[PDB]
Design an enzyme around this catalytic site. Structure first.
Site, mmCIF file in Angstrom:
data_model
loop_
_atom_site.group_PDB
_atom_site.id
_atom_site.type_symbol
_atom_site.label_atom_id
_atom_site.label_comp_id
_atom_site.label_asym_id
_atom_site.label_seq_id
_atom_site.Cartn_x
_atom_site.Cartn_y
_atom_site.Cartn_z
ATOM 1 N N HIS A 23 0.823 -1.198 0.000
ATOM 2 C CA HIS A 23 0.000 0.000 0.000
ATOM 3 C C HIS A 23 0.869 1.265 0.000
ATOM 4 C CE1 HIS A 23 -3.743 2.246 0.883
ATOM 5 N NE2 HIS A 23 -2.901 3.082 1.464
ATOM 6 N N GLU A 43 1.258 3.815 -3.262
ATOM 7 C CA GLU A 43 0.824 5.208 -3.198
ATOM 8 C C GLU A 43 1.992 6.157 -3.473
ATOM 9 O OE1 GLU A 43 -2.438 6.439 -2.822
ATOM 10 O OE2 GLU A 43 -2.932 4.304 -3.050
ATOM 11 N N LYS A 103 2.772 6.152 -7.236
ATOM 12 C CA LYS A 103 1.806 6.916 -8.037
ATOM 13 C C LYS A 103 2.151 8.398 -8.032
ATOM 14 C CE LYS A 103 -2.460 5.836 -6.769
ATOM 15 N NZ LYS A 103 -3.352 5.343 -5.675
ATOM 16 N N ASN A 104 2.538 8.906 -6.858
ATOM 17 C CA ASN A 104 2.904 10.309 -6.709
ATOM 18 C C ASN A 104 4.143 10.626 -7.533
ATOM 19 O OD1 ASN A 104 0.792 10.592 -4.944
ATOM 20 N ND2 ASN A 104 2.057 10.454 -3.077
HETATM 21 N N1 LIG Z 1 6.721 12.942 -5.262
HETATM 22 C C1 LIG Z 1 5.956 14.026 -5.346
HETATM 23 N N2 LIG Z 1 6.381 15.107 -6.133
HETATM 24 C C2 LIG Z 1 5.606 16.231 -6.233
HETATM 25 N N3 LIG Z 1 4.419 16.399 -5.582
HETATM 26 C C3 LIG Z 1 4.013 15.330 -4.816
HETATM 27 C C4 LIG Z 1 4.705 14.117 -4.609
HETATM 28 N N4 LIG Z 1 4.010 13.267 -3.778
HETATM 29 C C5 LIG Z 1 2.962 13.954 -3.481
HETATM 30 N N5 LIG Z 1 2.874 15.218 -4.054
HETATM 31 C C6 LIG Z 1 1.821 16.278 -3.953
HETATM 32 O O1 LIG Z 1 1.122 15.979 -2.754
HETATM 33 C C7 LIG Z 1 -0.256 15.623 -3.053
HETATM 34 C C8 LIG Z 1 -0.672 14.252 -2.846
HETATM 35 O O2 LIG Z 1 -0.731 13.554 -1.650
HETATM 36 P P1 LIG Z 1 -1.577 12.210 -1.754
HETATM 37 O O3 LIG Z 1 -0.763 11.154 -2.298
HETATM 38 O O4 LIG Z 1 -2.027 12.146 -0.349
HETATM 39 O O5 LIG Z 1 -2.799 12.492 -2.766
HETATM 40 P P2 LIG Z 1 -3.078 12.462 -4.337
HETATM 41 O O6 LIG Z 1 -1.944 11.856 -5.070
HETATM 42 O O7 LIG Z 1 -3.350 13.838 -4.807
HETATM 43 O O8 LIG Z 1 -4.419 11.537 -4.502
HETATM 44 P P3 LIG Z 1 -4.331 10.189 -3.921
HETATM 45 O O9 LIG Z 1 -5.317 10.055 -2.951
HETATM 46 O O10 LIG Z 1 -4.549 9.224 -4.940
HETATM 47 O O11 LIG Z 1 -3.086 9.921 -3.323
HETATM 48 C C9 LIG Z 1 -0.362 15.595 -4.589
HETATM 49 O O12 LIG Z 1 -1.705 15.952 -4.982
HETATM 50 C C10 LIG Z 1 0.802 16.415 -5.119
HETATM 51 O O13 LIG Z 1 0.373 17.747 -5.278
HETATM 52 MG MG LIG Z 2 -1.276 9.946 -4.181
#
Ligand SMILES: Nc1ncnc2c1ncn2[C@@H]1O[C@H](COP(=O)(O)OP(=O)(O)OP(=O)(O)O)[C@@H](O)[C@H]1O
Ligand SMILES: [Mg+2]
Ligand SMILES: Nc1ncnc2c1ncn2[C@@H]1O[C@H](COP(=O)(O)OP(=O)(O)OP(=O)(O)O)[C@@H](O)[C@H]1O
Ligand SMILES: C[C@@H]1CN(C(=O)[C@@](C)(O)C(F)(F)F)[C@@H](C)CN1C(=O)c1ccc(C#N)cc1
Ligand SMILES: C[C@@H]1CN(C(=O)[C@@](C)(O)C(F)(F)F)[C@@H](C)CN1C(=O)c1ccc(C#N)cc1
Ligand SMILES: [Mg+2]
EC number: 2.7.11.2
Lengths: 358, 358
Positions: A225, A229, A232-233
């Site tokens: 998990h 996650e 994906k980021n």
């Molecule tokens: N490696 C990264 N580089 C740049 N920005 C990032 C990175 N990881 C996270 N972020 C930023 O932080 C936010 C995401 O946190 P999070 O993973 O909690 O949510 P998300 O990707 O937007 O949706 P999800 O729920 O699917 O995760 C992103 O929307 C992005 O703006």
């Molecule tokens: Mg995410």
């Protein structure tokens, strides 16, 4: 008409943190032993998080949000009491418990989206200020940690009482393999949506045993998990920050095994994030491939659950490092549980208005 | 016999945070203008930190430690009042201020070691528990930040009123050059003590302007301090964790310039540190080439002083990344000052005894 009584009762006990070795040093190490343990423990954990909920401002309490979830917990508590006076030995009395657990687990399956809806209601009903964010953060972190711990117990019971795996625990989890998998899954999604994806590089650093592959005792679904996650980021950021160039840098992952920590660093060149916004990335309130989740805040709870952590540090204009810190020894992998005390009470007495810094 | 009165008076005002552009957009932009400003501002800053001190437990207050420092501040406050009724125009009334400042600055030159002695006294007189550590941490962080801000003002005045530099400010500071220097100085010390030292690698990432060297408006002595202290740590760890091998990995530094952050990462392979001990590294209490300092905690204060930060993340069994976060724009480089309010008062009311987690 006695839920408030039950809650008041088990709310007096404190939940019992279990260590991963206690989970391992356990088909039929007697589930009677588990049955009698879970009959008391689940009610104690359910009641503690329910007790906390009930002391929430009524303006949060009254939302269909919290009330619906709060009703599932009331029914799960009652659902598991039926067995307080029962007696094992009856190979049927404990098979109704297993079914009773599967039914409770599924009854709470959609909590995250449900709670997320209350956050949204709050955002539009009262606004999104630092204090309300802190309170919501404090509450959801504890609420979700609590849920993770209950689901761990339940899954351990149902899986063990349907070699190698002891429920959801892999005593010989090959970290690098889980990394590979979370990566492959992320790549597939990234390819479909962006039709281009960054590659993967993995490096291991086994301190004490230079070449041995890195293994650990852990709950692989949890590790997957977190890695999934984070992948994906990193993929999103890398792809989107290079749609105008061609070069597409790889996501590098390093797995380091020290005397007490097992660290996993995931490095990307997705442009990074301003130090000031990094803080908000783990916020449920401000944060309400990408969109559903509560990816970072919840991945972090999974890390903390067994005394680990999940930290992020970026270099705006270059990239980001996401690090998962886990305990290397099963002895140190003990459940981290939130408890209801006079201590937890005063964290909701935040009367902020004009700080200590100018 | 009126220090308690003065303190009570200026303790009503709040210190005025200045921005680095206000420092830059300033020989003879009139020191009369500075004189009249510092006559009010220094007394306000001195009084605020003195007011805070006076509300410290008497068991901290009574130590020769705090009392000696507290006496220097009393005399510096009185030292600068003499000018409240004076009148500029008199090219002699403002040259006595400059001398009055140099004298006050030197009067406080040995505060760090003095305060460190009170920390030690406390450690052995009352013990080193989490609460007393938090309180001491909270107090010393504010006390030292306050001191840094006063010394900035004073040095700006004395240097400007003894082209390119505006006091201690370099409007065109070449970050990489400062890195090189802090490194060379650290290497020299490392070579003398260990007769072996790690090399340096530097990489720049100018986001908006790919090849232009990275420059910024900053106080170079401050940047040097932070880099020098971080280099000493990385060198020690690298050398000591490889005294039995030969390979000696380099300390790599990356300077990244983003739209609002200017980040400096220093990477080493000195074996790293367990996540659990990382937290204690910035503690004055627990932390009382290496030995004098208060290297990390104070280097961090310098970073925070202008809205920056200094973070550490390790990978036990491999290495550590130390990152300095600075504001890229002079507009965002505004003094971060601690202020005395009803808010700062209740941070000393820590009555901890049994937490919220089990
Ligand atoms: N490696 C990264 N580089 C740049 N920005 C990032 C990175 N990881 C996270 N972020 C930023 O932080 C936010 C995401 O946190 P999070 O993973 O909690 O949510 P998300 O990707 O937007 O949706 P999800 O729920 O699917 O995760 C992103 O929307 C992005 O703006
Ligand atoms: Mg995410
Ligand atoms: N890069 C690093 N790798 C491993 N350990 C480190 C690193 N940087 C700091 N430390 C640890 O943290 C502690 C140091 O923090 P700090 O720099 O504040 O003090 P010091 O080096 O011991 O003495 P000094 O005052 O000169 O700095 C060290 O004593 C060491 O144990
Ligand atoms: C039986 C309990 C709980 N348990 C389990 O694996 C499960 C499958 O039952 C579950 F995951 F669901 F919890 C082990 C941690 C061993 N164990 C204990 O070690 C234990 C701890 C405290 C007490 C008490 N009092 C009794 C037993
Ligand atoms: C003169 C003040 C203080 N100052 C200075 O550079 C010094 C050398 O005097 C010192 F570093 F010592 F502070 C600039 C920030 C400009 N400046 C201001 O912009 C200012 C700010 C607030 C007020 C008021 N009220 C007046 C002036
Ligand atoms: Mg040091």
């Amino acid at each position: 008409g006695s839920a408030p009584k039950y809650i008041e009762h088990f709310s007096k006990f404190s939940p019992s943190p279990l260590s991963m070795k206690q989970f391992l040093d356990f088909s039929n190490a007697c589930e009677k032993t588990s049955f009698t343990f879970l009959r008391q423990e689940l009610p104690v954990r359910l009641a503690n998080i329910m007790k906390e909920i009930n002391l929430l401002p009524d303006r949060v309490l009254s939302t269909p949000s919290v009330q619906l979830v709060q009703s599932w917990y009331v029914q799960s508590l009652l659902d598991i009491m039926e067995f307080l006076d029962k007696d094992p030995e009856d190979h049927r009395t404990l098979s109704q418990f297993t079914d009773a657990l599967v039914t409770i687990r599924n009854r709470h399956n959609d909590v995250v989206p449900t709670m997320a809806q209350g956050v949204l209601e709050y955002k539009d009903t009262y606004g999104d200020d630092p204090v309300s964010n802190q309170n919501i953060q404090y509450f959801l972190d504890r609420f979700y940690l609590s849920r993770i711990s209950i689901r761990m117990l339940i899954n351990q019971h149902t899986l063990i009482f349907d070699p190698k795996h002891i429920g959801s625990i892999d005593p010989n989890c090959n970290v690098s393999e889980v990394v590979k998998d979370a990566y492959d899954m992320a790549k597939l999604l990234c390819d479909k949506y962006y039709m281009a994806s960054p590659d993967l590089e993995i490096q291991e650093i086994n301190a004490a045993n230079s070449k041995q592959p890195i293994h650990m005792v852990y709950v692989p679904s949890h590790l997957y998990h977190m890695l999934f996650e984070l992948f994906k980021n990193a993929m999103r950021a890398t792809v989107e920050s290079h749609e105008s160039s061609l070069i597409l840098p790889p996501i590098k992952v390093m797995v380091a095994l020290g005397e007490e920590d097992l660290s996993i660093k995931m490095s990307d060149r997705g442009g990074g994030v301003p130090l000031r916004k990094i803080e908000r990335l783990f916020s449920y309130m401000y944060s309400t491939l990408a969109g559903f989740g509560y990816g970072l805040p919840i991945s972090r709870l999974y890390a903390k659950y067994f005394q680990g952590d999940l930290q992020l540090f970026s270099m705006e204009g270059f990239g980001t490092d996401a690090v998962i810190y886990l305990k290397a020894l099963s002895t140190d992998s003990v459940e981290r549980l939130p408890v209801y005390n006079k201590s937890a009470w005063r964290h909701y007495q935040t009367i902020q208005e004009a700080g200590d810094w100018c």
